[PDB]
Design an enzyme around this catalytic site. Structure first.
Site, PDB file in Angstrom:
ATOM      1  CG  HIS A  70     108.724  21.857  56.951  1.00 21.27           C
ATOM      2  ND1 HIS A  70     109.970  21.775  56.719  1.00 21.27           N
ATOM      3  CD2 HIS A  70     108.320  23.136  57.019  1.00 21.27           C
ATOM      4  CE1 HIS A  70     110.428  23.021  56.376  1.00 21.27           C
ATOM      5  NE2 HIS A  70     109.406  23.818  56.566  1.00 21.27           N
ATOM      6  CG  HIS A 111     109.445  26.453  52.009  1.00 23.45           C
ATOM      7  ND1 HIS A 111     109.542  24.845  52.098  1.00 23.45           N
ATOM      8  CD2 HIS A 111     109.764  26.941  53.162  1.00 23.45           C
ATOM      9  CE1 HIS A 111     109.894  24.728  53.381  1.00 23.45           C
ATOM     10  NE2 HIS A 111     109.868  25.734  53.961  1.00 23.45           N
ATOM     11  CG  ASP A 169     107.440  27.378  56.290  1.00 25.72           C
ATOM     12  OD1 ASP A 169     107.574  26.240  56.187  1.00 25.72           O
ATOM     13  OD2 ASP A 169     108.103  28.339  55.786  1.00 25.72           O
ATOM     14  CG  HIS A 216     107.025  30.302  60.936  1.00 26.86           C
ATOM     15  ND1 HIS A 216     106.304  29.380  60.307  1.00 26.86           N
ATOM     16  CD2 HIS A 216     108.418  29.757  60.435  1.00 26.86           C
ATOM     17  CE1 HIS A 216     106.752  28.564  59.363  1.00 26.86           C
ATOM     18  NE2 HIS A 216     108.237  28.553  59.717  1.00 26.86           N
TER      19      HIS A 216
HETATM   20 ZN    ZN Z   1     109.489  25.876  56.221  1.00 29.91          ZN
END
Ligand code: ZN
Ligand code: PLM
Ligand code: MYR
Ligand code: CL
Ligand code: ZN
Length: 266
Positions: free
Chosen positions: A73, A225, A229, A252
């Site tokens: 973030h 979001h 990310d 991720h």
């Molecule tokens: Zn996040």
């Protein structure tokens, strides 16, 4: 764009979403060519893919025995505002989650930008590339401007939705909060994570409901979001990025995989 740093040091404090421990960061300005780096217990950890040590439920960096969890973030906000030279001192073992979005970071930093005397050497995607992992897929291709699309296929009321970020629409994603599916909370807790999670820092969604009393800020806050990310993970390339990205159910792990392949080719 010119390289940039902060006019004065900026600090933020709160709990880590995963450690549940108190943590604080102090962003200090640095001269041109310094780059983005964290500082913890005497060790400098560059914000680069080579230092990633974990990618399940957050992007964590580490070097010489010192680790920092959940850097996505703060890095995303820095990437979006093109801050290129700063030292992020970290007290604790994780970046504070705050409200789960990059809003506090964004508003503070945006008001304290200091242009420097050096042109930014952007990381420009030169050729099309695609990484996959059991259905999940991310494609990157050349573009003069950073464009990021995320398409999700949720097993709940969200169903199939997508969102596209383009330069200039930063405000459309910096408010999107961290989310989490009620049927996955036990697992997260079981693996020693999510210790600081609460309805204050994370959107908890059920098969057909939203637990948070405030509800969703946008009907597609989750995909917004995810875009947020990915933009943070992309900064692990070491420089602001120029390219068109499309992520289908990416996370991720896949984001870093793409980053490492891009760095490898170039
Ligand atoms: Zn996040
Ligand atoms: C995979 C990404 C995410 C990080 C999520 C970590 C947050 C853990 C969840 C904590 C919320 C707990 C809320 C209690 C459950 C309920 O009210 O139904
Ligand atoms: C809507 C604001 C109310 C605060 C959010 C409630 C969620 C907090 C529950 C998780 C905290 C307990 C941590 C633990 O498992 O020990
Ligand atoms: Cl895990
Ligand atoms: Zn897990």
């Amino acid at each position: 764009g010119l390289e940039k740093t902060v006019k004065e040091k900026l600090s933020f404090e709160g709990v880590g979403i995963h450690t549940g421990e108190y943590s604080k960061l102090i962003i200090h300005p640095e001269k041109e060519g310094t780059g983005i780096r964290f500082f913890k217990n005497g060790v400098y950890i560059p914000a680069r893919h080579e230092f990633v040590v974990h990618t399940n439920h957050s992007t964590d960096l580490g070097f010489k025995g010192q680790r920092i969890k959940t850097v996505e973030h703060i890095l995303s906000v820095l990437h979006l505002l093109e801050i290129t030279n700063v030292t992020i001192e970290v007290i604790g073992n994780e970046i504070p989650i705050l409200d789960g979005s990059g809003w506090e970071f964004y508003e503070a930093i945006r008001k304290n930008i200091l242009n420097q005397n050096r042109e930014i050497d952007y990381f420009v995607v030169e050729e099309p590339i695609i990484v996959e992992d059991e259905g999940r897929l991310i494609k990157a291709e050349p573009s003069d401007t950073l464009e990021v699309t995320y398409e999700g296929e949720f097993k709940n009321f969200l169903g199939r939705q997508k969102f596209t970020f383009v330069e200039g629409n930063e405000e459309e994603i910096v408010l999107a909060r961290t989310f989490a599916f009620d049927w996955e909370i036990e697992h997260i807790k079981k693996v020693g994570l999510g210790k600081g999670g609460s309805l204050k820092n994370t959107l908890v969604l059920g098969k057909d409901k939203v637990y948070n009393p405030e509800g969703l800020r946008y009907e597609n806050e989750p995909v917004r979001h995810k875009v947020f990310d990915l933009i943070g993970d992309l900064y692990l390339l070491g420089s602001p990025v120029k390219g068109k990205f499309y992520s289908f159910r990416g996370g991720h792990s896949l984001n870093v995989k793409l980053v490492k392949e891009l760095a490898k080719k170039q």
